[model samples]
Structures are given as structure tokens and as C-alpha cells.
Target chain A: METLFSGIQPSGIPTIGNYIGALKQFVDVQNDYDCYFCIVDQHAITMPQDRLKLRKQTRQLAAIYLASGIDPDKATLFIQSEVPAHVQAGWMLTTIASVGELERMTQYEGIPAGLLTYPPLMAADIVLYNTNIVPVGDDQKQHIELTRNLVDRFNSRYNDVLVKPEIRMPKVGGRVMSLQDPTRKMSKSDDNAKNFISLLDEPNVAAKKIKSAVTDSDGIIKFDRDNKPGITNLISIYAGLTDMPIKDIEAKYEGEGYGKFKGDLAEIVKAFLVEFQEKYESFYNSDKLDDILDQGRDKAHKVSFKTVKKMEKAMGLGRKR
Target chain B: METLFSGIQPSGIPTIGNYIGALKQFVDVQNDYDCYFCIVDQHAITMPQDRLKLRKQTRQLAAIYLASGIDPDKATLFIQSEVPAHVQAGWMLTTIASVGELERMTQYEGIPAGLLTYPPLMAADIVLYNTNIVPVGDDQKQHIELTRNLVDRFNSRYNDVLVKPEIRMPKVGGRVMSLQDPTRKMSKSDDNAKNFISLLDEPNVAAKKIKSAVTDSDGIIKFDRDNKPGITNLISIYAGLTDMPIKDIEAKYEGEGYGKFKGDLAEIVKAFLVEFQEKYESFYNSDKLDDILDQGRDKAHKVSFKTVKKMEKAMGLGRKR
Candidate 1:
């Protein structure tokens, strides 16, 4: 089976954008592809962070993955740092990669050096598993592109051991715009609570945020993204979660005022989150999450250890014994 | 016991400069400090290298270290990659270190980009052992300084788990100048074979190189660094190896001509290397070198594992069973 690898940062609570853009699609992919979903706690430290909160968020993200219908048996889910090979391969790849390639990275510019080199580690994460596909949002397109470049560089420079991974962009709801600011994507780092609807928020809280969400004065329910991005974004979120086409969604909400449409979206989001909250709570409270992480790490080691060993051998590193 | 850490690249055959400048000090430091002298094969890959040569040179360097009297019983000597903690801690320290700090490194500006970030891995090598002192030559002073910076950054940012390592400059023979070009330091990478005396070379070959070495038009056997650098360098090498003061070395050979001085210096170098070559041959031919490396890696693991474990605990990583 072709393997799939994806990494999510253990930042603040998962936002509505996370759920609609990537997490939900991850659940669907688990059924078909051999998936490895990682809570990239190591990557999170690229920026300054509160240690205690970082730990909490790491575990919380694992719980959220479980809650979102990623069956532990079907997919390998664990924290990134638990696998030593990720780091080993990361350093080895760093040697094969050049500063010019890293400097050209769109995501790396203006970020910390750690963040700049983050793609090499991500490449290691994917290539170690022989991953054939990486399901990523449009925002991460550059990282995936860099991953392919690194993979080719490693294979040509060393031995042909690494597999080049292709990007799997979601067909719908890939970029969720901020509720407070239509120009920017919804982000957990945004200080304004109205800017994002977190996965853990109560239904009423999500409803309130959506109700007060910024929209153009046109007050139309149509999906003309160029002229009406804010309203179109809300419609996209609603359509994406419900798996309804934009045309059908528009037909259902035609003539309904923006208030009623947002109210209905708030209810849909709340209901979806309520189900997620129960699963999230159960996974958080039970020992199952820990067991799953352990199992994933074990499975990951099987692939990662082999890749690291081969790379080490090719590079003439420490004796095999 | 105070921990001491030092590393040498397994790049090529050891030059006489490597011996007087760094390796001899490592052997002496083992008597005074709990020492970890690593064959940093991982660091060697930062530049393009031949795989076969790298593998051969790695073991060869290890054999030379054993031959040079770095008793395995007294010091933990191993390949850096043998301990996974080196790479693990390297990645972690890279996150804590700032881009501005890494960019400020003088050595980073001089070499390739891979060599630029090489300090973080070096920092990891030292800090992982809780090193109290890191013996480095003048060229590596910046890296040692960076290691201390990382230790301070990590300690203040996280728990005070990493120990700040101090730079221990060799009291004697810190910078051995090139034979052909007295103005420049002796480098293994120099294209001219006559410029360096490899420890593995025949005694006659080394003596010939020394005899043909560059000298000024007016070769008055005086120890004038500005005017008579070639003669001064020859005297310094003799003084360093024999533990004689510069004045004593000059007095012993004051009336001696340049040819006689070169001949005597060659004899000194040849005698020292004869013993080293014998030991190297014995260790390389037998399994003694392998056994020593195994023991060294184990010793390194014992100390580094503690720090890695503490760090994992501090970061709340999955507990190892």
C-alpha cells in the first residue's frame, strides 16, 4: 500500500479552519491510505513557546486526532520527537541540502532559522516512511515542493533510497479565511477571539463568533469569491463540513438573510463539535491514546530505523553493530 | 569528576599539525578530566566526501587516537553518530539558538553553509555529556563560544539541564603553521603534499618535506616570528613535542644551520610517529579498535542518555519502556 504522511503542529487548540481544511480530510484518507499523522511537537518549538502549554497542546492535538475519527488501528499517530530516526535523518539531509534552496523557501522567509530548516525535517519525516503522498493545504504547497527537492537531492547525492512524495490537495475547503479579517487565513495565533472558531469551543460560543463575523455590505448569499470573500468563506465552511456542493448550498440558503444563514452554520458547526468533543474527551481521559501513540511509535520505528540505517550505511557512519 | 569533551573529524590521515595542535592535548586531558573524544564522522559529511574514504578514514582516525595514548580506559572515545543523542540534542539546540547568533559566527562566514550550522551539532556533542570543558584550537574558539551561548539559551528557556561548557585552549602548540607557507596555518586540505606531514607517511618522506620546506633568504637561526617564520615554526614544533621552552630549543640549535635544524625537527616528528604508527597498526589489524569504539559508545550513551532522558521528561516526551 502507498503510504501517506502528514504533520500538524501542536500549537493552540485546533481552529475551524483546521477541521474543515485538513483534519476532516485526514479522517477520510485513513480508510484508503496507510496514514502516519504526527503531532509535530518538535516543529512547534521553532518559535518561542510556553513549555507547559506546549506539552498540554501536544497531548491535546493527539486527542483531537483520535476524536476526529482517525482510527488508531488504521493509522499511525504519535508525537514527532518520539522517533529518533526523524532527527537522525533530519541532520543527514541537512548535509545534502544547500542554504540557497532553504533561503528560497517562501515559508522560511521572516521565520526563525529553526523554522527555516523545518522543511528538511519534514522531508525526513515523509521520506523515512517511503511516503508516496502528503495531504497538505495550499498554504503548505511550498513545503511539499521543498520536500520533493530534498528527496531528489538525497537520492542523487547518496543512494536511491528515499521516495519522492506527491502533494494531495483537498478538493474543497482547503483555505478557510479568518472570520474577523477576510484577507488572512484563520489562525490560532490570532489574538482576536472573533477571528477563529476553535474545535473545542461550545456551540453557543461558535454561533456568537459566526454571527458577528465580518462580511461585505452586499449582504448577498451568492458564492462570488472575488467580490464577496467573507460571505463565500462562511458558505464554503458550511458546505465543506456538510459535504454539500456550493450550488446546492446557495439554493438552500437563497433569500435567507446573512443572520439566518450564519445561525444555521453555527448550529451545524456546534453539532459537529459536540460529537467531536465527546470523542475528544474519551480519548483524552482514557489510556487508549497513550497505547495508540506507543503502537504508532513502534510502527514508525520499523520504517524509520530501516531508512536511517541505510542512509547511515551509505554515508559510511558508525559500524553496523 | 569534571567532564571534558573534544572531537576530531575523520576527514583524512592525521597531519603533524593535528597531532601537536589538538590530538596530543586530548591524550593529556584524559589524565586530568573525564574525557569524551569523538570521531565526528557526522560532521565530516557537511561537505562533499567520498563514501569509501570517509568510512576508511573514520576507523583510521580512531586507531590513531588509540595509538596516540588516549587510553580507552581513561576516556570515552567513539564515533559521534554512534550515540543518537548527538543528533537529537543537535536538533533541539538548533531550535533554541537564534539565526542572528548563528550568522554572527566567524567560521560560519568562512566555510560552506553546512559548516555554518555545524556549531549546533558541536554544541550538542559537548552539552549532551554535561561537559565542563571543551578543548578546542583557536579556529574552533568561535564554535566553543556558540556552544556556551546555546547552553545558556536552553537553560534559561527550559529547565537548567544543559551545562555550559568552557573553552580550554591548549597551553602549547595551539596553532602550527604550514611548512611551505609559514604565514598560513597547516591544513590537511592544502593541495601541496609537501606542505603537511601525515602521521601515516614514512619517516623518510616527512624528513624530505621538512628539508625542502620554505625559509627566508637570510636564514639566521633566530626565533623572529616576523622575519624568520619558517625557522620559528620549526623550533616551535620541536619545543612542543620535546616539552622544551622556545628559548631552550633555540639555544640548542642557535649555531645550527637551517638544514641541520630541519633534519633534527624531522627526526623528532619521525620518532613520535613511529610509536604512533606501530600502535595504530596493532589497533587497526586487531579487533582492539572496534572493542574500544564499542566501549566508548556505551560510555557516551550512559552520560548522554541521562541528559536526553531528562530533556524528554522536561518536554514530556513518551517514556521509554
Candidate 2:
């Protein structure tokens, strides 16, 4: 079976928008591919971070994956820091990635030195597993492009050691926009509380935010993204939350004013949040999560160690075993 | 006991120049300090190397250390790549070491990328053993200085985990100049076979090379570096081989022409090489070398693994165990 790899930064609470775009999408594809989902706690340390918070967040992120229906038996979900091979292979790729190429990263300029060399760590996380495809957000496509280049460079420079991965851009309809400013993608770090719904937030609290969501005075319930991005965002969210077609949602809300349409969508969002939070809370408190993570780490290590040893041998690194 | 760490590149056979400057010097101090003598095979890959030759030289260098009086019971001797913690901590240090800082190394501008980040690997080799001092030759003084800065940076940026090392430059007159071009240090990489005698070279062959060593036409046996560098180098090599005082050597050669001095020194070098090669060949043929290396690696890993864990925890590179 082909492998799929991805990592989520364990820094903050991912929003509901993120779930619909990433984690929820991962659950559906788990059985179709061999998946390696990593909580990128090591990458989170590219800047100053509270160590306790960092550890707390790492476990929480793994729990979130479990809560979101990522099956332990079907997909390997582990922390990046749990696998030493990531950094081992990461260093090898970093040595080959020049200062010039690293400087070209989107967030590279004026960033911390560690972040400058971070592409290789990202590359390591994927290539170590010989991942065949990496599902990335559109904005994150550049990272996968860099990864492709690195694997190609590594294969040619040393031996043909790495599997070059192809990009799997997030499904088009999965693009979730911010609640307040529909033009921008929803972010976990958004300053305004009203801009995004925290996946773990109280359902009633999120329902209120949805009720006050922006829409034009014309108030037609039609989905015209170019002219009415806010309503279109809400319609997409409702479809994702309800597991109903966007066209079916349009028919139900046909000729209805923004108030009626918005109120119904709020309940749809509220209903899912109410159940999702319950699962999230149970997962956060469960002993099974730890057992799953332990298993995940062991499996990741088994594969990663093999790849790292091969890479080391190719580069004349490590001992002749 | 406080640790003293050092590494010798396993590129090729070392001459008496290296014996006097490094390995021979190490044997004297190993009993006083916790010593880690690493065959730095990993570092040799910064430039191109033959894989088979690299493996061959790595074992050869270890045997030479044993023959040169490095007792496995007295000091740990292992290949650098045998211990993974070196690179494990190395990547952490590299992430913290800035591009500007790494780019300032003397040979960094035109060197391969691995060498550009090599200072951190050197730092890891020392710091992993919690070394208190690193004895380095004059040309390597800058690399030790870089290691010092990295440890300081690591010590402060993360937890105060690393044991910072101080410079312990090799004995001043241990400087052994080349026979062909006396102004330069004798090197394993020298293109001219007549420039220096390999420790493993046949006694008669080494004797011929010693006799043909360059000297001033004035025929003075004085030890003036600026005016008579070639004779000064020969005098240093003789002292290193015989454990005799340079003053005694100068006195013995008083008023003697170049022919008589060269003739006597040839016999001295030949006799020492004969005995040294006998020990080297014995070690080369013995299973004891593998036993020694195995024990050294196990001992090195015990200490390095502890240090790497502390470093990883400090930098938040690995999971919080």
C-alpha cells in the first residue's frame, strides 16, 4: 500500500475550520492508505516555547487525532520528538540544503536560525517513511515542493535512498475561511475570538458567534462566493458539519433571509461541536490514548530506524554495521 | 573523574608528526583523566572518500592507537559513528548555531555544507562525554574555540546542561614540520611520499625517507626554526621517537655535518619504526582490536546517551521522558 504522511504543529488548539480541512479529511482516507500522522513537537521548538506547555500540547495533539476518529489500528499517529530518527535524517538533509535554498523559505527571512533549517526536518518527517503522498494545505504546498527537491538531491548525491513524494493539495471544497473576514483562511492564532471556532469550545459559545456572522444587507441565501464570501463560508461549514450536500443546504434555505439561514447553520455547528467536544474530552482523559501513542511510536521507530540507517550508510555516516 | 575528549580523523595513516602532536601525547594523560579517543570517521566524509578505504582506515587507526599505547582499560577508544548520540546532539547544536556564526569558519566559504556545520559535530563529540578539556593542535585551536562558543550558547539557551570545555593546546614544541617543506606541518595528505614517514611504513623505507629529509646547505645541526626549519623538524621527530631531550640531541650532533647526523637519525627512526610496526601488525592481526572497540563503544554510549538525553530534554528536541 502507498503511504501518506503529514504533521500538525502541536502549538495551539486547532480550530473547527482546521478539522474540516485537515483532520476530518484524514479520517476518511485512513483506510485507503498507510498513514503516518506526526505531532510536530520538535518543530515547535524552532522558537522560544515553554517546555511544560510544549509537552502538554504534544500529548493534547495526539489525543485530538484520536478524538477525530483517527484509528490507532489503521493509522500511525505519533509525536515527532518520540522518534530520534527524524532528527538524525533531518541533520543529513540540513547539511545538503544550502544556506541560499533555506533562505528562500516563505517564513525564512528574519526568522530564528533553527527555523531557517526547518525545511529539512519537515523533509525528514516525510521521506523517512518513504511517503508516497503528502496532503498539504494550499499555503503549505511550498514545503512539499522543497521536500521533493531534497529527496531528489539526496537520491542523486548519495544513493537512491529516498522516495520522492507527490503533493496532494487539500480538496477544493475543504478550504475553510475565517468567520469575521471570509477572505482569509481561518487560523488558530487569530487574535479575535469571534474569527474562528476552537474545536474544543463550548457548543453554545460557538453558536452565538455563528449567529452574529457577517452577511450583506441584500440577504439572499444563495451561495455567491465572489460577492457574498461570508455566507458562502457559513454554507460550506454547515455542509461539513451536517454531512449534507451544499446544494441540498441551498434548497432547504432557499428564499430564506440571512437570519433564518444563519440560525439553522448555527444549530448544525452547535450539534457537531457538542458531540465532538465530548469525544475530545473523553480522549484527553483516556488511558487508551497513551497506549495508542506508544504503539504508534514503536511502529514509526521500526520504519524510521531502517531508513535512517540506510541514509547514514549512503552518506558514510554512522558505523559500518 | 573529569573527562578529556579528542578525535583523530581516520583519513589515512598518521606520521610521527601526528604521534608526537596527538595520539602519543594522549597515552601519557589517559590514566589521569576520563579519556574518550574517537576515530572521527564521520568527519572524513566532508570531502569525498572511498567507502571501502574509509572502513579500512577506521579500523587501522584504532589498531594504531592500541599499538601506540592506548590501553582500552585505561581509555575509551571508539569510532565516532558507533555512537549515535554525537549526531543526535549535533543536530540540536546545529539548529542553535546561526548561519552567520557557522559561515565565519576559516574554510567555511568554499567547503562542503557538512563541514560548514562540522563545528557542532566537534562540539557534540566533546560535550557528549561531558569533557572538561580538549587537547587540540595549533591549527585546530579555532575549531575548539568554536566548540566552546556552541557549548556556551547551548548551556545558556537551553538548560545549563552541557559541561563546558576549556582549551588545552598540545605541548608547544610538539609542532613537527614537514621534511620536504619544513615551513609547513607534516600531513597525511601531502602529495610527496618523501615529505613524511607513515608510522606503518617499512623500517627500511622510512629510514631512506628520513635520510633524504631537506636541510640547509650550511650543514649546521642547530635547532633554529626560521634559519634551519628542516633540521628543527628532524630534531622534534627524533625527540618524539626516542624520548630524548632536544638539548641532548643538539649536543650529541655538535659540529657534525648533515651526512653523519642524518645517518645516525636514520638508524634511530628505523629501529623505532621496526618496533612500532611489530606492535601494529600484532594488533592488526589480533581479535583484541574488535573486543577493545566493542567495549569502547559500549562505554562511550553509556555516557553519551545520558548527555544526549539531557541535551534533548533541554532543547525540547526529543520527547520529555
Candidate 3:
């Protein structure tokens, strides 16, 4: 199977939109690829974080990955800091990246050095796995491009060692927009709690949120993203969760009033949450979660160590002995 | 004993000038403190380098450290890349360093990111060991100052886990000037190899270079730096290696002509080189070198790992479990 790499921050409980848009597809494709799902706890340090809370969230994120159907037996799931090779390889890549180019990046000023040097570390996360594909959102496409550039530089400058990874953008209909502001992407950090539903939110509370979602008085259930963004967002969320085609959902809701359609959709949302929360709770407080994470770390280290050694040799770091 | 940490780049062979100015003093104080003499191979890659030559130079530097009277048991000696905790802690420190401050540093442009961000890694090398003193040249005083700043920030921002290292500049008599241009410090990268004598240079050949060194036509042997920089530099080198006073050396050659004084100083240089080369050759090719390095690496990792873990926890990285 071709290798696929992805990294996620352990900041907060992921929103439902995050699940239906990304995690759900990850589950669908887990069996088809050799996956490396990294909870990038190190990257989280780029922003000021509550130490105790960050630690808890790291574990919680690992449990969520399991609950979302990422089988530990199939995909390697680990924390980034658990593997030392990431930083080691990251430092090597940083030595090759020019400061001017890093400054030219679509980033910041008066920011942490990590904010500027972050791309090389992210590149290390990808190339260290000899990854064939990197699954990233549009916001991260530039990072993947930089990773490719670093890989090319490393290969040509030294011996041909690192593998240039290809970017794999999420499939269409995977984007989950905000419920309150339909045009804006749903974010867990959104100021208003009603704008999004947390994966761990009370099932009834999530259902009420779905019921009260913003929509137009036109009362049509059809998907018209530009004309009726609010209703189109709701329809997209329904289609994503039910795995039904947009046309099929529109036909099923034909001639139905907004009240009836919303009531039924709220029930469906509640049932999905109830089932999902059960799995989440099972993994969240279990000893099995730690065991799975330990195994994942070992597997990740073993694979990444080989690539790091090759990179070290190619870049003339460690002694030949 | 207080811990002392120092890092050296394995760029090229050190000169007799380097030995007298720095390495010789390091040998004198090895047992006074717990010393970590690291060959910073990772830093060497910031500029372009030949892979094979860099690998060789790393080993050569370690051998030179041992040959220069650094007891393997008294001091921990290892390659920087050999212990992964340096970069691990380095990356953590990097997150706390502001880009504006890093740019304000007395450092670079289109240059490698390493050139801009090098101080954090240097800080990691010092703070990882809970170092009490960092012995560096005048040129590197700013980097040590930056290390102190980072330690202060890390302690106040997180927990008081890092040591605020103090700077211990080399003694005044330790400066070694160029043979041809006595006003400038002798450097290995000088285009004219005749200006400096490499530690690995043929002893007799080095003697010729020293005898032919530039001096005033006045032939006065007094240590007058302003009027006779050439003779003053040579007197400093002689006093450094022989552990004699500059005043005593001037008295010994008081009535002598320049040729006699030059020939005698040349032999002192040759004798020092021959003896140093013998010890250097023994460790350079011996199996004991690797054994010592292995022990050093294990010791370095054990100590640095403790600090890195504390840093990770304080900075909210890695899982609690």
C-alpha cells in the first residue's frame, strides 16, 4: 500500500463538521493506504497553551481517532514529540532553507521562530516517512509545496535520499461551513458555540443546534451554495452524514415543509451523536488507548529512524562509524 | 562541580593559534568542571560542505579533543547529532524565541535559516546540561548573552527548569595573531596557508612558516604589541604552549639576533606539534575512540533527555502518560 501522512493539532474537541469533512473520509480510505496519523503536540506549542489541558487534549485526540474508525491495527497513530527523529531531521532541513524564502512565506512578524521555521519541521514530518502522499487542506497546500522543494534540494544537493511527496487535497463535498455564517468554514475556536457542534457535545444539544440552523424563507431543500448558502450548508451536512447523493437528499425532501425536514434531520443528527459518543467514551477512559498509542510510537520510530539515518548520512551529520 | 558546556564546529583542522587561544585552556580546566565538549556537526552544514570531509573532520575533532588532555572519563565528549535531545530542546526553545529578536541579532539575509536561528540551538547545547559556565571567544559573547535571555524567558514563562549560564571568555593572553598580517586573528580558512600552522601540518614545515613570520627591522624582542605586533604574537604563542611568562621569554632572548630567536621559537612550535600529533594519531585510528564516543553519547542523552522532558512538560508538549 502507498504511504499517506497527515498531522492534526490537539487543541480542542473537533467539531462535527471536522468529522464529516475529514475524519469520515480518513476512515473510508484507511484500508487502502498505509496511514500515519500524527497528533502534532509539538506544533501546538507554537501557540501559548495550557500545559495540563494540552496534555489531556493530546490523549483525547488519540482516543477520538480511534472512535472515528481509525483502526490501530491498520494505521499508525502517534504523537509527534514521541519520535525524536522529527526534530533531528527538521534541523537538517532548516539548514537548507533560505531565510529570505522563509520570510517571503504567507506567515507573520514578531511571531515565534517556530512560526517562520515551521514549514521545514512540517516537511520533516512528511519526508521522514518516505510518504508517497500527503493529505492536507487548501490552507496547507503551500506547506506541501515547500516540502516538495526541500525534498528536491535535499536529494540533488546531497545524495538522492528523501522521497518527494505528492499532495492529496480532500475530495469535493468535504468542506464543512459554519452553521451561523454559511460562507465561513466551521472552526472549533469560533467565538459563538452555536456556530458549530463539538463531536463530544451533548447529543440533544447538538440536535437542537441542527434544528435551529440558519436557513432562508424560500423553504427549498435543494443545494444552491451561492443563492441560498444557509440551506445549502445544511443540505451538505445532511448528505455527508447520510452518505447519500445531494440529488437523492433533495428528492427525498421534495414538497416537505422546512419544519418537517428540519425535525427529521435533527433526529438523524441526535442518533449519529449518541452512537459516536458511545465509541468515544469507550476509548477515552480505557487502558487500551495508551497501549495503542505506545505501539504506534514504536512503529513510527522504527520507520522514521531508518529514513533519518539515511538523511543524516546524506547530509553528513552523524559519524560513519 | 559546576557544569561547563562548549560546542565546536568541525569545519577544518584547528591551527596552533586555535590550540593556544582556546583548546589548550580547555584542557587545563577539564577537571575543574563537568565538561561537555561537543563536535557540532549539525552546525557545520549551515554553510556548504563536502560530505566525506565533514564526516572525517567530526572524527578528527573528537580525536583532537582526547589528544589535547581531555580525559574521556572526566568529560563527556560526543557529536551533537549523536544525542537527539539537543535539537529536541532546541525546537522547544525556538518556539519561545521571537522572530523580531532573532532578526535583531547581529547575524543575516538570503542565508540559511540556520544562520538566523543558530543561537537557539547553541542555547540548547548550553541549557541542556544545566551549564554554569559557557567558555567562548569575544566574537561569541553575544550568542552566550542570547542563551542567558532564552533561559530567563523559559524559566519565567514556564517552570524554572533551565540554568542561566554565565560567560567565561578566554584569557587576554590567548589571542593568536596571523603570521603574515599580525594585526588579524589567525584563521584556518585564510587563503594563505602560510599565515597559520594547522595541527596536522608537517612539524618541520610548520617550523619553516614560523621562522619566516613577519617582524620589525628594529629586531627588538620585547612584547610591545603596538610597535611590534609580529614578535608580540609569537611571544604569546611561546608563553602559551611552554607555560612561561612573556616577560621571561623577552629576557631569555634579550641580546640575541632575530635569526637565533626565530629558530628557537620555531623548534618550540615543532616540538609541540610532534608530541600533539603522536597522541592525536593514536586516538584517531583506535577502536577505543568509538567505545569512548558511545559512552559519551549515552551519558549525554541521559542528562539532556531529563532536561528536554522537563522543557516539553513546561511548554505543554508530549503526552502526560
Candidate 4:
């Protein structure tokens, strides 16, 4: 099976945007590909983080993955730092990478230097598993491109060991807009709490946030995003929850006022999240989360070891055994 | 006992300059402090390296350290990559460090971006063991200073788990000058082979290199570094080998020609290296080298685990066992 790699930073409370944009797709991909989903706690540390919150966020993210239908038996899910080779290969790739190339990275240009080299480490995360495809958001497309560049550099410089990976963009419901500001993507870093609905939010609380979500002055809703961004954003969210096409949802809600359409979306979102929240609580309370993670780490090592071994052999590194 | 941390990259062949300037000091310091001397093979990969040479150099460097009087029983000596926490902590430190501080580092300013962040990892190396002192050459003083800065930052940011380490500048022979160019420090990266004397170099070959070493027009052998760089470098090398004061040696060789001084220095260096080479061969040929490394890794883990455990507890990380 072709390997699939994807990761989420345990930076903040995961949101509805996360579920529709990444988690839901991961559930479907696991059956078709050898999947490795990771909670990248290491990457979260690039910025100043509260230690207690970081630990809590990591476990919370794991529980959410399980709650979102990522079957532990079908897919591998673990924390990134548990595997040593990620950083080992990260350091190695740093050598073959040029200052000019790392400098040219769009993500690194304005941020701190740590953020600049973040792509190289991310490259290691992908190449270390010999991943054939990296499922990423549009924002992360550039990093995947750099991963391909690094893989080619390593293969040509050393022996041919690393396999070049392809970027697998999500086909549907890929971008979710902010509830408060339709122009921007939903983000946890937004200071306005009304902008995003967190997965862990209580069903009633989430419903309130969705109901209060901004809409346009016009009553007509025909998926005209450029003309009516707010209503279009709500329509998009409703479609994402139901996995229905945006046009179909827009057609169904053609003449309904903005108030009625939003109330219906709030209800659907609340109902789904109520079940999700229950599952999240059960997963955490049952002590099964730890076992799942342990198994996930084992499976992760099985896949990661193959790539690490190939890398080591190509570079003539010291053998473990 | 106060802990002392030191490491050498397994780059090129171990040279007599390396032996006298750094490795020799490590052997003697072991008697006074709880020494943790690492063969930093992981650090070597920060630049493009020949794989086969890297492996061979790592082992040879380890053997040379053993041969030069660093008793494994007295000090911990192992490859850096063998201890995963080194890189783990390195990645963690990278998060707390600022781009401005890392960029301001003199060594990082000249080398690739990998070398720029290299000091943060070195900071991890020292802080991981809660090192009380770090022995470094003058050129590496900035890295040690940065290590102090990181320790302070980590302690203040988290609970006080890491001890701030001080720098221990070597009293004698901290740096050795190049034979071909006395104005410059001896470097493995220098283009000319005659610039340095490898510890394993054939005695006659080394003697020829020493005889052909650059000198001034004046035959007078005085310790005037500004006027007579070549003669001064030769005298310094002789002083380094015999543990004699440079001033006293220069007075003794005041009337001597460059040829006599060069011949005597070559004989002294050859004798010292021959002894080292024999010890190196014995260590390499026997299983003692592996046994030493194994024991050293255990020792390293003992100290490393203590610091890591304390930091983890302070940071509220989950305990594995």
C-alpha cells in the first residue's frame, strides 16, 4: 500500500475547521492507504507555549482523533516526539540543505529563524516514513514542495534511498472560513472567540456560536461567495457537516431568510458535536487512549524504521544492533 | 564532584593539533571532574559529509580519545547520536532561542544555517548533563556563552531544573597554529595537507612536513610571534609536547637555526604520536573500544536521565515508567 502522512500541531483546541478540513478526510484515507497521523507536539514548541496546556492539548487532540472516527486498528496515530528518527533525520537533512534554499521558504521569510528551518524538519517527518503522499492544507503546500526538493537532494547527493513524495490535497470541504470574518480561514490564534467553534466546546455553546455567526444583509443565498460571503460561509459549513455539495445545500436553502438557514446549521452542528463530545469523553475516561497511542507508536516505528534504516544505510550511519 | 562537558566532532582524521589542543586536555580533566566527553557524530552531519568517512572518523576519534589517556572508567565517552535526548533537548532548546541571538553567534554567521543552530544543540549537550563547566577553545567561546544564556532562559522560563554552566578555558595549548601558515589556527578544512600533522601520520612523512614548515628569513629563534611567526609556532608545538614553558624553550633555542628547532620539534611530536598510535591500534583491534563505548553510554544515561527526569517533572511531562 502507498503510505500517507499527515500531522496536526497540538497548539490549541481543535476546531470544526479541523474536523472538516483534515480529520474527516483522514478517516476515509486510512482504508485506502497505509496512514500515519501524528499530533506534532514538537512543532508546537516553536513558539512560546504553556507547558501544562501543551500536555493537556496533546492528549485532547488524540482523544479528538479517536472520536472523529479514526479507528486505531485501521490507522496509526501517535505523538511526533515519541519517534527519535524524526529529529535525527531532521538534523541530517539540515546539512544537505542550503542557506539560500531555507531562506527562500515563504513560511520562514518573516518568522523567527526556528520557523525558517521548520520546513526541513517537516521534510524529515515526511521522508523518514518514505511517505508516498502527504495530505496537507493549502497553507502547507509549499512545505510539501520543499520536502520533494530535499528528497531529491538527498537521493542524488547520497545513494538513492528516499522516495519522492506527492502532495495529496483534500478534494472536498478543504477550506473552512472564519464564522466572524468570512474572508479569513478559521484559526485558533484569532483573538475573537466568535470566529471559530472548537471541537471540545459543549454542544449548546457551539450551537450559540453558530447561531450568532455573521451573515450578509441580502436575503438571497445562491452560493454567491463574492457577493454574499457570510451566508456562503454558513452554507459551506453546513455542507461540510453533512458532506453534501455546496450547490445542493444552497439550492435547498434558496428562499429561506439568513436567520432560518443559520438556525438549521446550528442544530445540525450541535447534534453531530453532541455525539462527538460524548465519544471524546468516553475515550479519555476509559483509559483506552493510552493503549491506542502505544499501539500507534509501535505501528509508527514499524513504518518509520524502514525509512530510517534506508536513510542510515545510504548515509553509512552507525547501526543500532 | 562538579560535572564537566566537552565534545569533539568526528570530522577529518584526528590530528596532533587536535590531540594537543583539545583531546589531551580532556584526558587530564577527567581526573579532576566527572567528565562527559562525546564524539559528536551527530554534529558532523550539520555539513555535507562523506558517509564512509564519517563512520570511520567517528570510530577513529573515539579510539584516539581512549588512547590519549581518557580512561573509560574515569570519564564518560560515547557518540552523541547514541543518546537520543541530545537531539530531543536540542529541538526543545531551538524553540526557546531567538533568531537574533542565534544569528549573532560568530561561528553561525560564517557557516551554513545548520551551523547557526548548532550552538543551541550544543547548549542542550551541556544542559542535559547539568554540566558545571564546559571546556572550549577561544573560537568556541561564543557557543559556551550562548549555552549559559539558554540555561538561564530555561531555568527562568520553567522551574529551575537545569544548572547554569560556566566556561573553562584551557590554560595551555588551547589552540595550535598551522604549520604552513603560522598566522592562522590549524584547521582540518584547510586546503593543504601539510598544514596539519595527523596523529596517525607516518613518522618520516610527518617529519618531512615539519621540516618543510614555513619559517621567516631571520635564522634567530626568538619567541616573537609578530616578527617570527614560523619559529614561534614551531617552538609552541615543541612546548605543547614537552609541557615546557615557551619562554624557557625559546631562550634555549635562541641561537639555533630553523632547521634544528624544526628537527627537534618533529622528533618530539613523532615520539608522542607513535605512543598514541600504538594505544589507538590496541584499542581499535580489541573489543575494549566497544566495551568502553557501551559503558560510557550507560554512564552518560545515568547523568542524562537525572537531568531529564527533573526537567520533565518540572515541565509536567508524562513519566514513561
Every model's DockQ? 0.30, 0.39, 0.66, 0.30
- DockQ, candidate 1, vs. native dimer: 0.30
lDDT by residue (tens digit), candidate 2, A1-321: 889998888889989888887778788888788999998877887777877777778777877888889998899998887788887787777667766676677452223457666788899999999999887756677788888988888888778899989887334336789889999989889888898999877899899889777777547777779988989998888877777887888888778898888788788888888888788878878777777788999999999999988987887754454
Q: Return the top candidate by lDDT.
A: 3
Clashing pairs in 2: none
Residues A1-321 of candidate 3 have per-residue lDDT tens digits of: 789999989999999888987898888788888899999988888888888899999988998889999988889999999999999999999999998878767462368888888889999999899899887666777788888988888898898988888878345346778888898999899998889989898999988888777886558788888888888888888887898999998899898867877788888889999998899999998988888999999999999999999999987888777
Top TM-score prediction, candidate number: 3
State in Å the error of residue A268, model 1: 5.1
Candidate 2: regions farther than 4 A off: A106-111, A169-173, A217-220, B106-111, B169-173, B216-228, B247-260, B285-288
Q: Give the worst 10-residue stretch by lDDT in candidate 3 chain A.
A: A167-176
lDDT against true structure, model 3: 0.86
Candidate 1 vs candidate 3: the TM-score winner is: 3
Name the weakest run of 10 consecutive residues (lDDT summed) in model 4 chain B.
B312-321
True contacts kept of 4: 0.34
Whole-structure CA lDDT of model 2: 0.80
What clash pairs does model 1 have?
Answer: none
What are the per-residue Cα lDDT tens digits for candidate 3 across B1-321? 888888888998999888887788777677677889999998898888899899999999999988888888888999999999889988988998998888877452368888888789888988999999887767777788788888988899788998888887434347899999999999998999889989999999999998778886548678888888998888888898898888888889888777787888899999999999999999998998899899999999999999998988887787667
- On a 0 to 100 scale, what is the lDDT of residue B257 in model 4? 83
TM-score of each: 0.83, 0.92, 0.94, 0.84
Worst 10 residues of 4 chain A by lDDT: A106-115
